[PDB]
Amino acid sequence: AGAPKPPQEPDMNNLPENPIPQHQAKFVLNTIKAVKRNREAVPFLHPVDTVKLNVPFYYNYIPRPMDLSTIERKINLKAYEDVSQVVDDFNLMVKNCKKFNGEAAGISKMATNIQAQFEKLMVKVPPKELPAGTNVA
């Protein structure tokens, strides 16, 4: 080819010491789970099938790919320090699709559609603090 597919994120040797609090991790997880139910998200659920789509040089244009499952795995492995990194990863996913395919491609409109859905949900994200009377041992 044809640049090979880069290794999966995250690097389980650089897991952050202070991850996002669980109440924030539960929210962004349910948010990503809600986006994964959207019919428009199907192409973004998993890494690109470079053989089925016949894009041998895809990883030459996109050196850092991203998908909804990777974002989900990084949350489950506590790889994020701030919820803004989850937003940045979702943005990178949309950016890669528009960069490679272009605003004319209908797959870019699917990415735009799920990004709007993601942004509507992230409006109600709880603050990084715990709450009112949540106790600390």
Residue numbers in the entry: 191 to 327
Give sentences copied directly from the paper behind this entry.
BET proteins are chromatin-associated factors that regulate transcription and chromatin remodelling. BET proteins bind chromatin through their two BDs (BD1 and BD2), which specifically recognize histones acetylated on lysine residues. In conclusion, Bdf1 BDs are required for the viability and virulence of C. albicans and can be selectively targeted by small-molecule inhibitors without compromising human BET BD function.
These structures exhibit the canonical BD fold (comprising helices Z,A,B and C, with the ZA and BC loops defining the ligand-binding pocket) and closely resemble those of their human BET counterparts (mean pairwise root-mean-square deviations (RMSDs) ≤1.5 Å; Supplementary Table 3). The ligand-binding loops are structurally well conserved, including nearly all water molecules implicated in ligand recognition, although the overall binding surfaces are less negatively charged in CaBdf1. However, whereas JQ1 fits snugly into the Brd4-binding pocket, the fit with the CaBdf1-binding pockets is poor. In addition, the p-chlorophenyl group of JQ1 occupies a groove in Brd4, which is absent (BD1) or shallower (BD2) in CaBdf1 (asterisks in Fig. 4c). A similar lack of complementarity between the ligand and binding pocket explains the insensitivity of CaBdf1 BDs towards PFI-1, IBET-151 and bromosporine. More generally, recognition of the four BETi compounds by human BET BDs involves 16 residues, including the eight signature residues previously used to classify human BD-binding sites. Five of these residues in BD1 and four in BD2 are invariant across human BET proteins but diverge in CaBdf1 (magenta arrows in Fig. 5), including the WPF-shelf Trp residue and the Leu residue opposite this shelf, at signature positions 1 and 3, respectively.
